[PDB]
């Protein structure tokens, strides 16, 4: 409990590590701002080494030294009373090559990754003739893939009845051992609600979700 890194401190009390493999002034707990899980929410995703590079002094290291090699640990926790209910799905997929709305085009950069701001899913299709937009129908998970099969990646269940938090540890997964961090996002974090949030009247109408990221062994 109450681990420390640099000048930040997060308190805790399970863990799931990578594919069985265990992975200096930047090693601090960067914490993105929280999203609000409502009743009829859809899902969120962040591209991983882009949401950091816009903001912190880790991003100040990014413009100086482009090419690097990193390893991540990810804390995800949401806080609610006993009286709510629902079930999330935290999965850290590598090399998420999403598909465009229009069939002949490719999605542009501004839709592909909100820098430290969560892009959202939806539960319908999208129109195609407009511009470069990501095909963001949730029940094919954006990749043309059946969503129920997504647990082949390192995943972790959050079930509001018993469990409350989630921790992920992801080692460096790439073909070439050194690449530029501007044109290649190796990891992708997803949060999908399967059993939707429900509550009776008088409770709070939303459950906030915080995600806390920390790099480990960042070389350049």
């Amino acid at each position, epitope marked *: 409990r109450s681990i420390t890194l640099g000048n930040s401190t997060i308190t805790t009390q399970n863990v799931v590590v990578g594919y069985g493999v265990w992975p200096v002034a930047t090693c601090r707990f960067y914490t993105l701002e929280s999203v609000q899980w409502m009743k009829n929410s859809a899902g969120w995703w962040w591209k991983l080494p882009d949401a950091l590079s816009q903001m912190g002094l880790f991003g100040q290291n990014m413009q100086y030294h482009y090419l690097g090699r990193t390893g991540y640990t990810i804390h995800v926790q949401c806080n609610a009373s006993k009286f709510h209910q629902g079930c999330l799905l935290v999965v850290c997929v590598p090399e998420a090559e999403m598909g465009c709305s229009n069939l002949n085009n490719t999605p542009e950069f501004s*839709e592909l990754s909100g820098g430290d701001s969560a892009r959202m899913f*939806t539960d*319908t299709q999208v129109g195609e003739s*407009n511009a470069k937009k990501v095909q963001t129908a949730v029940w094919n998970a954006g990749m043309g893939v059946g969503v129920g099969n997504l647990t082949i990646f390192p995943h972790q269940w959050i079930n509001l009845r018993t469990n409350n938090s989630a921790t992920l540890v992801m080692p460096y997964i790439n073909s070439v051992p050194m690449d530029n961090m501007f044109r290649h996002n190796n990891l992708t974090l997803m949060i999908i609600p399967f059993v939707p949030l429900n509550y009776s009247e008088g409770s709070s109408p939303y459950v906030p979700i915080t995600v806390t990221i920390a790099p480990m062994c960042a070389e350049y």
Partner: antibody
Framework: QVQLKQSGPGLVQPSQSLSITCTVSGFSLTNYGVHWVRQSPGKGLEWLGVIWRGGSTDYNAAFMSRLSITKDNSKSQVFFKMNSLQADDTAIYYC?????????????WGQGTSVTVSR | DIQMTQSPASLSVSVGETVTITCRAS??????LAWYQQKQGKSPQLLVYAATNLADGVPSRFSGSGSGTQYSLKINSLQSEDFGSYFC?????????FGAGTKLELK
């Protein structure tokens, strides 16, 4: 959070050009796209055009040549130029933000600027 | 092109009944519908997006249903402020079109 506001001419001359500057607040421009929607008493509601959050633009079919919508990121202002300003454009004009939780729907709007064309 | 037909034109009911309103499209929209309400001399506001998902500030009295082309909205109990206009709008593809616009006298 304070929403967006706007300011227009209010009175023009017929067969001219127009410029409304809509000022946003509370949100960035890389996450939301603004919508230009004309509320009219005669034709009702009608949508003109959208610049997306990536800078690419869209237009209505019947207004392909007389519009030019653009924005700035840091100054957080959007500009669009209605042109040729004919006698059927006597309507109030709205600035409105989009992308309500990623759904392409108008979340909040401006205050509305009423314009007329004639003397 | 895609068109929306709002029906009926206008209603005049008392306060507190279960009233309904529909609008039909021309082709499929895949539930990409948004309903709007504007009173006299103000901006419109969004109530239901994606034809069933209600907004944040809207009460639970409003509900919308439908799939494909036939879509509808339901107000189970009207109040004093529940008059004003009502508009439905698709957002499938540019060009986005709107509905006609209904009105409530609340006699």
């Amino acid at each position: 959070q304070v929403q967006l506001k706007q300011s227009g001419p209010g009175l023009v001359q017929p067969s001219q050009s127009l410029s409304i500057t809509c000022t946003v607040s509370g949100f960035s421009l890389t996450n939301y796209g603004v919508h230009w929607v004309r509320q009219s008493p005669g034709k009702g509601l009608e949508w003109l055009g959208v610049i997306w959050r990536g800078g690419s633009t869209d237009y209505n079919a019947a207004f392909m040549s007389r519009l030019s919508i653009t924005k700035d990121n840091s100054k957080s202002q959007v500009f669009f130029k209605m042109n040729s300003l004919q006698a059927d454009d006597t309507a109030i004009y709205y600035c409105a933000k989009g992308d309500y939780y990623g759904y392409d729907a108008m979340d909040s709007w401006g205050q509305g600027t009423s314009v007329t064309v004639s003397r | 092109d895609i068109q929306m037909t709002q029906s009926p034109a206008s209603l005049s009911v008392s306060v507190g009944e279960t009233v309904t309103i529909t609008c039909r499209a021309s082709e499929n929209v895949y539930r990409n519908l948004a309903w709007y309400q504007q009173k006299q001399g103000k901006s419109p506001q969004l109530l239901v997006y994606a034809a069933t998902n209600l907004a944040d500030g809207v009460p639970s009295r409003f509900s919308g249903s439908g799939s494909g082309t036939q879509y509808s909205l339901k107000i189970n109990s009207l109040q004093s402020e529940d008059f004003g206009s009502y508009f439905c709008q698709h957002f499938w593809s540019p060009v986005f079109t709107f509905g006609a616009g209904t009105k409530l006298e609340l006699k």
